[PDB]
Subunit: 71 residues, 4 copies
């Protein structure tokens, strides 16, 4: 809890569960660790923009399973 100079920790303090899966190009799930003590999910949109998703949101868990499935 004593940051190193220029250290990058958690990326997403604000999150949403309101995205349409058809607009997502890829998804990254970053588990808890020494860099940040909360799970963070980042969705990369087809246009390159990125958005912070709520890992605990039921809708987000279902979006992740459909993606895995090729849905």
């Amino acid at each position: 809890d004593s940051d190193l100079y220029a250290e990058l920790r958690c990326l997403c303090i604000k999150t949403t569960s309101g995205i349409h899966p058809k607009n997502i190009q890829s998804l990254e799930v970053i588990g808890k660790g020494t860099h940040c003590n909360q799970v963070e999910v980042i969705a990369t949109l087809k246009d390159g923009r990125k958005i912070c998703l709520d890992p605990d949101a039921p809708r987000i868990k279902k979006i992740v399973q459909k993606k895995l499935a090729g849905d």
Copy 2:
């Protein structure tokens, strides 16, 4: 440009996974690709259709 993951696995323990990237099918890759990054920086492809993997993903998402 094409598929990166030609060999995949389904028996990795979740304690070792730091993060996962899920990429859908595209013009030059007709399969969903799941790349896990280990705590030691090494990377591996996971079988997206194996039930063991679907559960490891849900646990990673929940803080497991």
Copy 3:
């Protein structure tokens, strides 16, 4: 400026060139794009902590070249 709700843009507003190459596990170089109009370099330390490196610093460019080479 119009950001989408919960959008993630630039990650490193503070950067440094004072890092020892031997402590770096992996390096990520993220080019400019719609998500952020400046190059960003994130070094992941052996312990998992992450730090923002200066891409324009001669010392950083040389650290990337020795890493590519297996140093």
Copy 4:
């Protein structure tokens, strides 16, 4: 988990690369791995020893 890049390439245009990740040799992968993510989300392995790749990396760092 071990070496992810068995096939690498040295002829991709930097215009297509969004980001690169460089991973050093470890206990079970005796080669530096360079994974490029294209703007379409596909991933590819780059030959770290080729001069055309060493230069593409420097252009990326420089913002070209």
